[PDB]
Every structure is written in C-alpha cells, then in structure tokens.
C-alpha cells in the first residue's frame with residue numbers, strides 16, 4: 182500500500198505509528214503529491230470586513246482589487262473566495278491564495294502595486310476592516326486528505342497530483358502520522374499568541390505574533406455536482422450536525438484550544454454563493470485539534486455518518502488540509518477589525 | 532515537584548519495575564494532560580502473571596435453576612479450599628440462544644497456585660466426573676493467564692477495586708496515559724516494545740461442538756479479553772438515573788451488536804452480565820466480558836461504533852461531578868499457551884465454541 186508521506190520525505194522514524202504496518206484502511210482515501218521542488222508553501226488568507234449593508238459595494242470592490250493583484254508577477258498559483266458572518270455580526274470576505282514557495286509570495290507582497298495598496302492611508306479611512314493571515318508550512322509540516330482524486334481544492338491545487346489509495350487514515354491519530362515531520366517530531370506547541378504592534382481595543386493597525394506549532398485546518402465540503410438525494414444527504418443530514426460543531430468552536434474557542442473558527446461559503450467574483458464551503462480553524466496546538474475531533478459529539482456523529490455512507494458517495498466531495506508552523510512562518514495583520522477578529526481574540530495584549 | 536504534578540511529572544500507568552527503554556512511542560507528547568483524573572492498579576515485581584478463571588454453569592429450562600444454583604454454590608465452596616482464588620464474584624446473563632449462564636470468576640496472584648487448585652483432588656474429580664455429562668447442565672472453564680506486562684486496568688475511582696484490581700497491591704495516583712484513543716494500548720507495559728499482534732486461529736483440539744459433551748478449544752496468540760464494568764449500587768438517585776436512563780440503553784444496544792455481529796468485527800464472544808449474590812439475587816453491578824480476535828479490532832470498534840462513542844461522550848460530559856457511579860475496565864492479552872477454553876454439554880454458540888474451526 183502507498184504511504185501518505187511522499188517518497189523524498191520518508192526517513193528513519195524515531196517516533197512510531199499507533200497501528201502496525203499490517204493495518205488496512207476501511208475505505209479508500211487519497212493525498213496530495215509533490216516532489217522535492219515543493220519545499221514550503223504559503224497559504225495567504227486576505228480579508229475584508231464590514232458591518233453594514235451599505236458597505237457591501239466597497240467591500241466587494243476591494244475583494245476585486247485583491248483578486249486583480251493576483252494577475253501580477255509572482256501571484257498565487259491558486260485561489261478561492263469565501264463569505265461568512267461572524268458571531269459579532271460582521272461580514273467577512275476572505276480570499277485565500279496559495280504559493281509554491283516563500284520568496285515568490287514575499288516578492289509579491291513587497292511589490293509596489295501590492296505593498297502601496299496595503300500601506301495606504303485609505304485602508305484607515307475606507308470604513309472597512311482589512312486583515313492578512315499568512316502562514317507558511319514546509320512540505321513536512323502539512324498533510325492533506327481527500328475522499329476523491331480529481332480537481333483538488335485548497336493546497337492540493339498547487340501540488341503535482343494525486344496519490345493512490347493511502348494507508349495512514351481511518352483511525353484517530355492518522356492525521357498526525359500523515360505529517361512527514363511526525364516521523365521525528367511531536368509538533369509540540371510552545372510560546373504564546375501575542376500582540377507585538379498596536380492595541381486591538383483601539384482599532385487601526387494591529388500585528389499579532391504566532392507561536393511554534395499553531396495548527397491550521399481547512400476542512401471542506403463541495404456539494405455543487407450533487408443530485409437531489411445526495412444534496413439532501415449533505416444539506417439535511419450531515420450539515421446540521423456540522424453546523425452545530427462549527428457554532429461550538431466559534432463560540433467556545435478558548436475552552437478547547439481554538440484561536441479562531443470560521444465556517445465559510447464560497448462565492449464567485451460577483452459575491453454570489455457557490456455550493457462549496459469549508460472550515461478555517463486556528464488551533465493553539467495540533468493535539469488540541471486531535472482532542473476535539475476524537476471526543477466532541479458533533480464531529481463524532483458526522484465521522485460515523487461518513488463511515489456509513491462513504492461507499493455510496495458519488496458527487497459529494499469532502500477533504501481537509503492541516504498545517505503547523507514555526508513562529509517565524511506566521512504573519513497576522515489586522516487593520517480596523519473588531520477586537521474578536523481571528524488572532525485578535527486570544528492574543529495577549531502588550 | 533509541585534503539589535499537583537502535571538505533564539511528564541504525572542504518574543505513569545506502567546509500573547516502575549516494568550518500565551523500559553521504548554522502541555514504540557506514544558501518540559501524544561509527554562506534556563499531554565488528561566482532561567479528568569483516572570487511576571490504575573499497582574503491583575510490585577512479586578506479581579508476575581495472574582490467572583483469570585471464568586467458571587460457568589449453563590441452562591435453558593426453568594426447572595434447572597435450583598440444580599444450576601447448587602452447582603454454582605459448589606464451585607464457590609471449592610474456593611474455600613487451599614490455593615483458592617484471592618478474589619471472586621458471580622454473575623448471571625441470558626445469551627442470544629435463550630440459555631441462562633451463571634459465571635463465577637476467580638482471580639489468582641500467580642500461575643502455580645491456580646494449577647495446584649485445578650489439579651487438587653476435590654476440584655479435579657468434580658470436573659472430570661462423568662456426572663457432569665448426565666447432570667443436564669452445561670459447564671465451562673475459560674481460564675486465561677496474562678503476564679504483568681500483558682494487562683492494563685483503568686478506574687474512574689480510587690477505592691475497593693473490582694476484578695483483577697482486587698488482587699493487586701493498591702491504587703495509583705493520577706496516571707497520564709488515558710483520555711484518548713490508543714491510550715489503552717499504551718497502558719500495556721509490553722506496548723513499550725511489542726505491537727501485540729495476533730497470529731494463529733481459534734481451533735477445536737478435542738471433541739466436537741455439534742455433538743456436545745466435552746469440547747476443548749485452543750486459543751491463539753494475543754487474543755484480547757476486556758472486562759468493562761459498571762457499579763451503581765451505592766449511587767444516589769441522580770447518578771442511578773444517569774446510568775440507567777442515559778447510559779444503559781445505548782450500552783445495551785452496543786453489547787447486543789457485539790453479541791449478534793461478532794464475526795463481522797472480530798469479537799469471538801461477547802457477554803453482558805449482571806452480578807448476583809450466592810442466592811441468585813441481582814446486584815447493582817454489571818460488566819462486559821468480551822473475547823476478541825485482536826486488540827486492534829477492539830480498538831477499532833470502540834473508537835468508531837456509535838454505541839461506544841455515544842456513552843464515551845456522556846462520560847466526558849459528566850466526569851467532573853461523578854461522585855459514586857463506578858466505571859472501570861481491565862484488558863488483557865495472552866500467549867496461545869496461556870489460554871484454556873473447556874466446554875461440557877454447552878450449545879455450539881457458547882464462548883469460543885461458536886467461532887472455532889473444527890476437525
């Protein structure tokens with residue numbers, strides 16, 4: 182059987198799996214593949230925040246400027262746009278871009294068209310909140326799991342292609358084992374989430390410094406091609422419980438180790454909803470994310486439903502990507518966002 | 532250290548004399564902290580190998596009860612003899628064939644003393660007697676012997692340990708290795724170096740289940756036996772309701788599933804049994820006795836089946852203010868040579884008889 186860890190990233194283990202190498206998964210799953218050219222990716226989540234209905238035109242146009250900036254040299258290899266209303270009632274458009282290396286994203290960010298737009302005084306007088314949550318896991322610091330083989334969303338889009346049926350899945354602890362670095366490293370968290378510039382209670386520019394081995398999960402649902410029955414299976418049977426789980430993490434973040442939970446729905450360039458959604462969740466450690474997914478009733482119910490219905494899924498597309506990062510490989514900037522926005526909520530003030 | 536140790540300063544499930552350099556690691560960092568306290572049986576190097584002897588009486592007809600209850604009283608009286616078990620308890624259950632089963636379980640602190648007991652005249656002559664074939668009652672002996680490295684215990688209470696805990700020296704402080712899937716495995720001292728993999732098949736080596744009479748089944752390497760218990764006898768009303776209204780119906784469902792869908796998941800035998808006194812009156816204590824094809828298969832069921840997951844989450848939700856409701860378990864693995872499954876006039880679906888190969 183094929184391994185989730187790419188050939189060039191396999192090495193002598195100093196840490197072992199929780200199942201023997203004879204283990205056989207209960208159903209097929211697939212991972213994203215990439216050769217040694219893919220060393221470190223950049224996942225850049227770029228947000229526009231607004232409270233009122235009359236702010237929408239300005240917000241959508243700002244989103245369109247950001248997307249136009251991707252056509253410039255060194256733009257992201259892939260991107261998608263989403264919408265959500267957070268628990269303070271604020272609307273958030275988020276553009277996620279994926280780069281294949283660190284230096285391209287740096288060149289892109291620092292280029293005059295992009296850096297000037299960002300550093301501009303207008304951003305302080307548009308009435309809108311802006312943020313950038315940019316994280317850069319090495320190849321060994323992320324894993325992908327797909328219940329499908331074709332047209333990979335998320336970070337899978339910037340990888341080479343799809344693996345065969347992989348071994349390391351279908352049990353709790355399998356996620357950890359799909360991180361190549363888990364062969365040698367505990368991905369243990371240390372440090373605090375801290376403001377290093379500004380004051381969230383005052384608005385304006387605020388910078389938050391991440392700490393080592395914060396985790397980021399993008400877990401997605403794509404029901405766009407689903408027929409009536411499968412449409413109803415996901416939307417009427419699975420989602421209600423997923424919704425409940427997303428609400429819990431959103432409103433009970435501190436209690437379980439979740440810095441920020443977002444349940445977003447994809448949009449087109451004009452801001453119409455598409456039939457894909459996903460979770461963007463930031464975690465104080467990977468093992469807290471492990472503890473929630475394996476113990477909380479909401480996830481446990483959908484997990485079980487999946488086991489029951491997996492063989493019969495035809496068009497419903499489910500997947501995740503999970504990441505951990507060094508302190509230095511994280512950047513979280515907020516301009517005029519409300520104090521509960523993303524990494525602002527739990528960041529210790531200076 | 533501090534008044535309340537945490538992380539790597541917390542006590543280990545693994546007895547001090549049984550700790551070694553690991554070749555197989557845990558699935559959590561050493562800084563891991565359990566969300567609630569749990570405890571384990573402690574024993575020094577004097578305890579090397581225990582014997583768990585599950586002794587059975589089986590019947591189907593109403594008029595066999597006094598004959599069954601008397602046969603049980605006799606097996607229990609045999610425990611008063613020299614080299615008897617250090618602890619015992621008696622249970623009743625009806626299997627999926629409608630047959631009633633009385634099981635007495637004895638725990639020994641060492642292998643040889645149980646052997647001196649099994650062979651001693653009053654016991655051996657009772658077992659081998661041809662009267663057992665004509666009494667009308669079914670009889671069985673499911674005697675397993677795990678080494679200290681080959682069983683783990685977990686208690687959500689600190690006092691009066693039931694099962695194999697009763698024959699150990701005492702209770703640990705807060706242990707680190709619980710609260711996640713895979714922690715059961717990690718509580719086995721042998722898990723430090725061994726994968727506890729199963730090999731070989733369950734085989735009839737004497738007699739024939741279909742005919743009846745005497746049948747002897749040989750176990751294979753690393754069969755797993757779990758006893759997972761519930762004690763609500765001394766609980767106040769609210770915790771009695773918690774267990775009987777909120778936990779028991781889905782626990783029952785889950786046991787029914789394992790009882791009736793064994794082969795599909797690798798559970799050779801599953802029994803859900805209620806404790807009784809010597810007179811056959813029910814007590815407010817029960818447990819599962821489940822023999823499994825492998826520890827991995829028990830692991831797979833418990834972490835994925837909606838019945839176990841449901842009650843697992845209920846415990847997580849009530850754990851903080853549990854006061855008198857008592858839940859625990861013990862899980863063992865054995866070498867093929869440390870297992871004995873004997874059956875006299877039991878129906879072909881009893882214990883290891885059901886899934887054994889023949890000839």
Ligand code: HEM
Nearest residue numbers: 350351352353354355356398400423460470474483484487
């Ligand atoms: C409604 C959509 C979802 C379904 C049907 C579902 C179901 C499942 C299933 C079946 C697995 C086991 C995967 C395997 O190894 O084969 C799994 C893993 C996992 N899921 Fe979900 N899930 C969903 C959404 C989410 C979300 C939104 C999160 C974010 C908290 C999440 C967190 C996790 C984590 C952390 C794992 C890894 C468990 C481990 O291997 O230790 N899932 N999910």
Ligand code: HEM
Nearest residue numbers: 709710711712713714715759761782819829833842843846
């Ligand atoms: C009173 C009903 C039960 C409740 C409330 C319950 C709850 C739980 C809890 C909370 C744990 C985790 C303990 C910890 O590590 O902190 C656990 C573990 C486990 N339970 Fe149960 N349980 C029950 C009955 C059973 C039964 C009858 C079985 C028999 C198959 C079973 C099989 C297992 C297994 C194999 C584990 C080990 C999980 C692992 O660490 O991988 N449980 N149970």
